[PDB]
């Protein structure tokens, strides 16, 4: 199996993130996706949880009261589990926009590869089960996901989901949830990322 693209995702995109809390003996660790500059992707259910007082990413500590610029993605007025967060000034992330987005839909039963830094680095995989308008979760309804047949675990949220369409493999999701042997990831589109990055002021050149 060619895994060159997934290896590049592990090398440049997926990183661990740990949220520190005052009501548990240990931090909550999962994965995050570096997009470009000072902007990354993270699950909304993790970001919005009220307990954490700081988090660490890329060797940096950030407190909850910092003036983060954020976008919470919605679909037809229903919340998704996807947040984009732009940090204050600091050392830049790689520009990983070449690794996100597919213009065609993945075929039924094609291979999904998850790329995680949640428990050290690892891959997981399962068959693509299709897009769903929403999932019903212990925290409410979330919109615009796709599913895959593989048992997933607490902490695996934020892992990059690499799918295949039109002879190319790209990241089109971030892991969100699990239910009885089936995982669900929140969909990522290139157009949505670009629109949100512009809203947050992450400076980029436009190819003309």
TrEMBL record:
Role description: Lies on the inner surface of the capsid shell. After binding to the host receptor, the capsid undergoes conformational changes. Capsid protein VP4 is released, capsid protein VP1 N-terminus is externalized, and together, they shape a pore in the host membrane through which the viral genome is translocated into the host cell cytoplasm. After genome has been released, the channel shrinks.
Q: Which organism is it from?
A: Senecavirus A (SVA)
Recall the taxonomic lineage recorded for the source organism.
Answer: Viruses, Riboviria, Orthornavirae, Pisuviricota, Pisoniviricetes
- The name of this protein is Genome polyprotein
* Residue ranges annotated for the Peptidase C3 domain, each copy included: 1-193
* Annotated compartments: Host cytoplasmic vesicle membrane; Host nucleus, Host nucleolus; Virion
- Covered residues of the complete protein? 1512 to 1719 of 2181
TM ranges are none
């Amino acid at each position: 199996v060619d895994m060159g693209f997934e290896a590049a995702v592990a090398k440049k995109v997926v990183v661990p993130i740990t949220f520190m809390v005052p009501n548990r003996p240990s931090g909550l660790t999962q994965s995050a996706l570096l997009v470009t500059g000072r902007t990354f992707l993270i699950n909304e259910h993790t970001w919005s949880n009220p307990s954490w007082t700081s988090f660490t990413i890329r060797g940096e500590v950030h407190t909850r009261d910092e003036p983060f610029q954020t976008v919470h993605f919605t679909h037809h007025g229903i919340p998704t589990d996807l947040m984009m967060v732009r940090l204050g000034p600091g050392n830049s992330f790689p520009n990983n926009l070449d690794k996100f987005g597919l213009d065609q839909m993945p075929a039924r039963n094609s291979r999904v590869v998850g790329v995680s830094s949640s428990y050290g680095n690892f891959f997981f995989s399962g068959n693509f089960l299709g897009f769903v308008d929403s999932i019903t979760s212990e925290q409410g309804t979330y919109a615009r996901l796709f599913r895959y047949r593989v048992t997933t675990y607490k902490g695996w949220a934020g892992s990059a989901l690499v799918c295949e369409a039109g002879g190319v493999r790209r990241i089109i999701g971030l892991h969100s949830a699990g239910a009885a042997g089936i995982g669900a990831g929140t969909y990522i589109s290139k157009l949505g990322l670009i629109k949100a990055l512009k809203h947050l002021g992450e400076p980029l050149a436009t190819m003309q």
